[PDB]
């Protein structure tokens, strides 16, 4: 199905990990903040769900 996802890559061109920001609020936070490690706090999020 059509889904927005976030994909990381390493130095070898291999995919490290995926987000799939259509399932979890933390996933939507990760797609919103453009990062896989998120600092402690409150953040507004986008409408990826």
């Amino acid at each position: 199905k059509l889904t927005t996802i976030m994909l990381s890559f390493d130095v070898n061109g291999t995919i490290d990990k995926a987000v799939d920001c259509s399932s979890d609020p933390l996933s939507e936070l990760k797609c919103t903040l453009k990062s896989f490690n998120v600092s402690k706090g409150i953040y507004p999020t986008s409408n990826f769900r």
Binding site: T4, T32, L33, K34, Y43, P44, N47
Partner: protein, 50 residues
């Protein structure tokens, strides 16, 4: 920018870092003025009664 539009969002997915800058700057400004309001008023810790 995009009124829940798929093509508009698909094109903005080439400008993700711009809105990351905007959201981070506005959140920092909001936290900054929460700190300002705390610093101007909350100087004494013991709330003395009338």
């Amino acid at each position: 920018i995009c009124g829940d539009s798929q093509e508009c969002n698909k094109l903005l997915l080439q400008y993700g870092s711009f809105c990351a800058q905007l959201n981070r700057a506005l959140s920092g400004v909001a936290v900054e003025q929460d700190k300002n309001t705390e610093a101007v008023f909350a100087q004494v810790k013991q709330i003395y009664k009338a």
